[PDB]
Structure 1
């Protein structure tokens, strides 16, 4: 933090310390100022905040009224569903608290400090600003500080930039302001030293470090409300107000009837009927099993994602994946596989589009290029498949193995007879080999230092290079590779005296050049198709990487996010933009490059500020704040534990196409939830229509609270779940993300609910009337029969809004068939001689009256299918039915 622009001396005078260390008294004094070098809503009376839900208020009042009326067991049943669904909400809030853990067991446990004039190892938590720390290879950087002594020091800063490659450190003052990854004279707590010796003065400990800033970012990330959760809140308020209006109307009708009517009835009988009708409508309108059924449908979605090795922690998260509009992705490790890979090559004697795959189909230039790439390196791959060596060198033996040439056969056939190690100030490596009684020296390295030592080229024979069209073409192709962000290596050999047994450093001149290679961190194979798949779904994909701008533009230009000559925003350029300017430039970036961990969480917050449900995919500590802040965080299975604990879905097999698949799965989840809710309320609406009609005509209440509770809880639970198991619709994933403000009955579902409900109600009204011709008790049995059987049979009509049961496949959904058969068993249980008076079914209720009621239910469901088929064959633009 602006320390890297100062010299070591200025930083020393700022911390009031020298390079010979601190004394014990000064260290104790600074420990009181700074503290030790370490990091550091939920409450179970929230069970009371579950009682702010209107449906809960309605059911609590209905339960108390029934308590007063003497209906105790149905009051107890209501209290059971209340207690249960409340704990269904508490289990959704409690687990999110262990996501607020910030488990940093990756901090360094030891510090190698100079104190009192003596080098000693201390607990790293005891470090303080001004301490002089020594770094050696394999040590973990214990605190942030400014280097003042470096001996070829190289550190892995993959926790801040996402790149596991070691960066070289230098003690020089950085004159200009550069991004966080390019702070060459700064070391950061949490990183791992790879090579060299170092010595730095601590400038930051505890939460005043870059990793401490990451911990603070994780802390501030607060959970969002789910789109389904918002839709259900708004609908619950509407249902509560409506029910309150119906109850006021019930008391109004009862009071006007006793006031402006026949004196026969009592005030007591009228007030009791008013209460019974109000409680009946209250229970009938509320789908008491809704949150439970929704949980089961969500579970089916998360299991379908689990078969693809995508483990979703929270159940509602799968539905949120369906409403995704922006997918922010990290590059290294996420879009790619963090695997250096040969992608292009150049041979002067003919370059092909792709390198051939038969080792015997190759040209002599191709076989010599492969032999030099394999024999001039020390990397290896064992039988298990573990890679050992520099990833640049493992890229070459992986290239040979990819093209059906086992690198081991070449290492076994040509043995190493002498080597020159790779020098830093002489980026070059040579090995000595005997090729069919001819000794040769193989040599490889970067084109800049290799062209200066090449005096021959391998075209047809061994030929001297002319500057025009040979060296100029080589430099043309090298800089063309650099424009595409490719690491280039030049290869060559030298025929050697047959008496040589060792290589000398004076023998690395007049080399015969063979060819060139170009390697990059390539995207995953499924990335191209997934990005196109998400574009068809109305999903914007943004790339947020800590890698360099050139690499981040080359990729992204390759995966279909950037056209040629499109620029990527940098963390340096981003930190200088205020939020208002970023709000106006946010929708026109596609790639951010070389960003800090705070930049990612800032972009994700900005996209959420646009109102978009955002997903963030990542694999490292630099993504963790953005993974926790995002609406849905997806971590790579091969990523760090910090990002996995911060994410909501984890791709165990690193299968990138799972993300888009999750969106597709999520979309069908919500579609099926909509189906189930529409199925549930269509039944409730039919019940309300039957009760209110019985009210305005002064009939007996067609239903009992115990009957309504039994239908809404036991009979209608399996059919709603079965509707939850419905196949994905054909044109899903061709659709745009749903609006968050969209209602839960939007898009023809409201029309479907009212049509099916009115039909069920008319069926119950006619059924109750027919039963009313015998006795009031017979009318209750027939109204209950028609209601429960029309709700059972409606499942066929509720499977789809645009397709009859016979059309989709009458047996295409086997869970619906089993559900209807099981509900028939339920209705049969209600008429068993023991449970008849329980369900208010008189002894005289026979197969004749049952036949009439069941026929009415079946006729109503046939009318639902007829109305649907007329609506979708003749009014198919905006589906609306008539007849």
Structure 2
């Protein structure tokens, strides 16, 4: 768009890149009807077969049944699209608060607007992992590794430079602009946005559980339709009256009505509705649990996470350390808070290097900006003997090493008292192998075996206390103001060692224990010294007895054949790498064991992609979130355990709701079949069965899918990788539930047979519908009873039960008894027998549940 040929200053002049609202309304902002969705949601095969049944039931000129079935379709359609609109609003909220925020320099005004409210002509800084939202010209960048797999499918990391492209335009390998829709793999993206999202080049361009459940629905539909074909054949050939069959031409309509109503009852039309509704409410629960899930198909498998590979920093640690103990080569206890003066030479040297190498500062109280280790060190300095940060401003910062990932020598040089003071921090072992002088008062003499042994002794002593520890050095040549380079890095003295405790977040111990009780083996990666992380894991609670831990160096130097054997008994990885992250996530995925990675860094994205349910931290980079199936806003590990608990609750809601629906439908089916085998009038007419399918297979099933967490969700083994909807325990529950309720309907039909066939039909219908509405109570869980869990504890269930009771209260009205095949008027006993049978059914059902709690497991 005429920006390819311009250089940096030419883009500044031509596009007026440096009122901001004027440019926003002038250049433009850089950001499906619901009835159309309702029209397009008829793809459900259950909805298709029910709508063809509704249209044929309309074409025989019968009105009330047609309105009943049509009402079933519209209520499930409107509840599906209403919860779909709720999911759309939730997704818009997730895209709003977790929007990619680009740090904007603008006209020198350092702030950070979101992606939608950007405007061309303002400077934007892109750090590593800061996904660039809008295309724009770049002037300087240091090795800006930019991949373009989404903008144009360019998998290569193109390094944008100062060079422009005059008299040529091409979206391929070009360096002139950093286009939108691109991820900063590495580099510093100091560029100016030149494009509205409309003019950006990228702007110009169901779940596996859902698929398995639709396959199960199609199998059940074929079987059920075969069953109704058999039922229609029974009504046809079993009796057929005599040879003349009276008026069989005008009497096949009622038999086809019975078979069709059997199809409507048995078919779970609200299957996909239940799944979508509980996925929406589960996602809302994850949002309540500080867990913004990105990939929608990841909700079902979150209940199946038999392993989670987390990291201690961020999740198992709220940052802001407090160093509790320290080592000095002279040797004493803590003496910093009391000491007004410099006190011992080791203490004062350690304090000055801790302050000087500290990149961060306390600033205003409660405001921490830098690295957590440096924030902790300056908070320690300011905690003991009051203010100590004021000493840094009277100390120049000449030579500062940029703290390379292979260096661990964050340096500092001052000219205030010492001329060329080589002041650096780093890891314990790296300084121990690098620094070569001991600090005993003014003596600066090299290491020996016993001295190095004592340093290592205090190092492992701090390590087994779960204390990460840093080493410091002072010794330097006089020389003069150097070029801030390494110079002489083999002659450094050893100042004392300060070991900082890594405190876990609140309720980390409880969540860890409840995850270990749930069979969810937890795995924690770290980058510090090994036995420090081992003691941290012992503190957390994932280390006991036979468990082992291996470093990253041993991780990448060991073939997978023995690592597979060792994998099940190891939870701590130290000095890990993203390649080792790929290794561990693939090894955990190999033996089933659904994995949830944790990487928040930029190059952790391959580990997040290969992870089944890899979660990126909210404080982490945006490219990891793109590579992640889900995000934690509060970044805590307790959010992961709450997330997998919510996933288990959602899958248990699937199991319980499908159990309720299939059990009631099977009870009706076996009632009809038992009336069929014994040469009996069928228990329910067409309109009665359609009204039962109206009352249930609906809002009560939705409410049963809205059931909260039973007290044993974190006490069970994780679900298998496959869906396993027809689990053996839940199949036993389904068959017992359906057989019992059908037994109640059969007994009611037999009692009604003692009076009249019409009384039998009416009593069987009311027994079935009352037993469905009251079995909604007993099917709230497979562990807790309706009274045990509390009736009002599930507000949706009791509200829906009252709703269906009111709706069934149409039957008692005399104006609807004719269409419902309810004859005459009741004194007491046309209702009392049915109510007693239904109450006995649900109480039998409940003591069966208690027996499974008491006798069985």
Q: TM-score range by the shorter chain?
A: 0.5 to 0.7
> Which piece of structure 1 moves more, 330-339 or 306-315?
330-339
Task: Encode CA deviations 1:36-89: one digit per residue, 9 max, x unaligned.
Answer: 999xx9999999998786534543453343233334565566567668868999
Quote how far apart the aligned CAs of 1:661 are. Answer: 1.8
- Contact conserved, 2:699 with 2:800, CA < 8 A, in 1? yes
SS of 2:187's equivalent? strand
Which residue of 2 is the match for residue 198 of structure 1?
A: 189
Quote how far apart the aligned CAs of 1:537 are. Answer: 2.9
**Closer, same or farther: CA 689–45 of 1 in aligned 2, 3 Å:** same
Task: Encode CA deviations 1:179-235: one digit per residue, 9 max, x unaligned.
Answer: 999999999999999999999999999999999999xxxxxxxxxx75643652453
**Closer, same or farther: CA 545–697 of 1 in aligned 2, 3 Å:** same
- Contact conserved, 2:138 with 2:162, CA < 8 A, in 1? yes
**Closer, same or farther: CA 565–178 of 1 in aligned 2, 3 Å:** farther
**Closer, same or farther: CA 78–588 of 1 in aligned 2, 3 Å:** farther
**Closer, same or farther: CA 499–640 of 1 in aligned 2, 3 Å:** closer
Distance 2:175 2:546 in 1: 29
2:140 to 146, 149, 156: 149
**Closer, same or farther: CA 730–479 of 1 in aligned 2, 3 Å:** closer
Which residue of 1 is the match for residue 489 of structure 2?
A: 508
Quote how far apart the aligned CAs of 1:584 are. Answer: 9.7
- Contact conserved, 1:103 with 1:642, CA < 8 A, in 2? no
Quote how far apart the aligned CAs of 1:658 are. Answer: 0.9
Number of equivalenced pairs: 857
- Contact conserved, 1:107 with 1:189, CA < 8 A, in 2? no
TM-score by length of 1: 0.65
- Contact conserved, 2:468 with 2:500, CA < 8 A, in 1? yes
Quote how far apart the aligned CAs of 1:652 are. Answer: 1.1
Distance 2:149 2:813 in 1: 70
1:60 to 51, 56, 70: 51
- Contact conserved, 1:255 with 1:270, CA < 8 A, in 2? no
SS of 1:834's equivalent? helix
SS of 2:194's equivalent? strand
> Which piece of structure 1 moves more, 250-259 or 427-436?
427-436
**Closer, same or farther: CA 455–234 of 1 in aligned 2, 3 Å:** closer
- Contact conserved, 1:321 with 1:663, CA < 8 A, in 2? yes
- Contact conserved, 1:179 with 1:572, CA < 8 A, in 2? no
**Closer, same or farther: CA 193–823 of 1 in aligned 2, 3 Å:** closer
Quote how far apart the aligned CAs of 1:788 are. Answer: 1.3
Task: Encode CA deviations 1:345-393: one digit per residue, 9 max, x unaligned.
Answer: 4212336699999999999965764355236756422216444667765
TM-score by length of 2: 0.66
Quote how far apart the aligned CAs of 1:659 are. Answer: 0.5
- Contact conserved, 1:160 with 1:622, CA < 8 A, in 2? no
**Closer, same or farther: CA 550–31 of 1 in aligned 2, 3 Å:** farther
SS of 2:490's equivalent? coil
**Closer, same or farther: CA 688–51 of 1 in aligned 2, 3 Å:** same
Which residue of 1 is the match for residue 61 of structure 2?
A: 70
Quote how far apart the aligned CAs of 1:778 are. Answer: 4.0
- Contact conserved, 2:147 with 2:157, CA < 8 A, in 1? yes
- Contact conserved, 1:181 with 1:594, CA < 8 A, in 2? no
Which residue of 2 is the match for residue 129 of structure 1?
A: 120
Task: Encode CA deviations 1:811-848: one digit per residue, 9 max, x unaligned.
Answer: 55454444433433222244335544554544635544
Distance 1:352 1:162 in 2: 61
Distance 1:874 1:358 in 2: 68
Quote how far apart the aligned CAs of 1:860 are. Answer: 2.5
- Contact conserved, 2:463 with 2:535, CA < 8 A, in 1? no
> Which piece of structure 1 moves more, 699-708 or 49-58?
49-58
**Closer, same or farther: CA 825–181 of 1 in aligned 2, 3 Å:** same
Distance 2:501 2:159 in 1: 20
Distance 2:227 2:435 in 1: 93
Distance 1:330 1:32 in 2: 45
Distance 1:324 1:449 in 2: 38
**Closer, same or farther: CA 457–673 of 1 in aligned 2, 3 Å:** same
> Which piece of structure 1 moves more, 88-97 or 163-172?
163-172
**Closer, same or farther: CA 452–246 of 1 in aligned 2, 3 Å:** closer
Which residue of 2 is the match for residue 717 of structure 1?
A: 698
Distance 1:652 1:485 in 2: 27
**Closer, same or farther: CA 15–559 of 1 in aligned 2, 3 Å:** farther
How do residues 515-594 of structure 1 correspond to structure 2 at under 5 angstroms?
Answer: 515-517=496-498, 533-541=514-522
Quote how far apart the aligned CAs of 1:397 are. Answer: 0.5
Quote how far apart the aligned CAs of 1:733 are. Answer: 2.5
Which residue of 1 is the match for residue 458 of structure 2?
A: 477
How do residues 321-336 of structure 1 correspond to structure 2 at under 5 angstroms?
Answer: 321-329=302-310
Task: Encode CA deviations 1:643-670: one digit per residue, 9 max, x unaligned.
Answer: 3344343211111211012112222232
- Contact conserved, 1:675 with 1:799, CA < 8 A, in 2? yes
> Which piece of structure 1 moves more, 522-531 or 129-138?
129-138
Distance 1:690 1:484 in 2: 68
Task: Encode CA deviations 1:586-633: one digit per residue, 9 max, x unaligned.
Answer: 879978899987886787567556544332333243344554554334
Distance 2:505 2:18 in 1: 50
> Which piece of structure 1 moves more, 687-696 or 708-717?
708-717
Distance 1:726 1:108 in 2: 32
> Which piece of structure 1 moves more, 267-276 or 177-186?
177-186
- Contact conserved, 1:154 with 1:166, CA < 8 A, in 2? yes
Quote how far apart the aligned CAs of 1:240 are. Answer: 1.8
CA RMSD in angstroms comes to 10.4
- Contact conserved, 2:710 with 2:783, CA < 8 A, in 1? no
Quote how far apart the aligned CAs of 1:153 are. Answer: 13
**Closer, same or farther: CA 160–316 of 1 in aligned 2, 3 Å:** closer
Quote how far apart the aligned CAs of 1:857 are. Answer: 2.0
Quote how far apart the aligned CAs of 1:321 are. Answer: 0.9
> Which piece of structure 1 moves more, 85-94 or 381-390?
85-94
- Contact conserved, 2:767 with 2:835, CA < 8 A, in 1? yes
**Closer, same or farther: CA 523–159 of 1 in aligned 2, 3 Å:** farther
Greater C-alpha radius of gyration: 1
Quote how far apart the aligned CAs of 1:247 are. Answer: 1.7
**Closer, same or farther: CA 410–711 of 1 in aligned 2, 3 Å:** farther
Quote how far apart the aligned CAs of 1:279 are. Answer: 0.6
Which residue of 1 is the match for residue 101 of structure 2?
A: 110
Quote how far apart the aligned CAs of 1:760 are. Answer: 2.2
Distance 1:565 1:784 in 2: 61
> Which piece of structure 1 moves more, 261-270 or 493-502?
493-502
Quote how far apart the aligned CAs of 1:637 are. Answer: 1.2
Quote how far apart the aligned CAs of 1:687 are. Answer: 1.6
Distance 1:490 1:426 in 2: 14
**Closer, same or farther: CA 125–247 of 1 in aligned 2, 3 Å:** closer
Distance 1:813 1:183 in 2: 59
**Closer, same or farther: CA 557–274 of 1 in aligned 2, 3 Å:** same
**Closer, same or farther: CA 13–97 of 1 in aligned 2, 3 Å:** same
> Which piece of structure 1 moves more, 58-67 or 349-358?
349-358
Quote how far apart the aligned CAs of 1:263 are. Answer: 5.3
- Contact conserved, 2:439 with 2:494, CA < 8 A, in 1? yes
> Which piece of structure 1 moves more, 573-582 or 227-236?
573-582
> Which piece of structure 1 moves more, 832-841 or 354-363?
354-363
Task: Encode CA deviations 1:20-46: one digit per residue, 9 max, x unaligned.
Answer: xxxxxxx999999999999xx999999
Quote how far apart the aligned CAs of 1:475 are. Answer: 8.0
> Which piece of structure 1 moves more, 671-680 or 494-503?
494-503
Which residue of 2 is the match for residue 17 of structure 1?
A: 17
Distance 1:250 1:406 in 2: 89
> Which piece of structure 1 moves more, 825-834 or 682-691?
825-834
Quote how far apart the aligned CAs of 1:690 are. Answer: 2.6
Task: Encode CA deviations 1:702-734: one digit per residue, 9 max, x unaligned.
Answer: 334444344334456444344345453444333
**Closer, same or farther: CA 204–451 of 1 in aligned 2, 3 Å:** farther
Which residue of 2 is the match for residue 288 of structure 1?
A: 269
Distance 1:425 1:267 in 2: 90
Distance 1:123 1:844 in 2: 69
**Closer, same or farther: CA 634–526 of 1 in aligned 2, 3 Å:** farther
Quote how far apart the aligned CAs of 1:295 are. Answer: 3.5
SS of 1:297's equivalent? helix
Distance 1:484 1:168 in 2: 45
Quote how far apart the aligned CAs of 1:568 are. Answer: 9.8
Quote how far apart the aligned CAs of 1:746 are. Answer: 2.0
> Which piece of structure 1 moves more, 514-523 or 69-78?
514-523
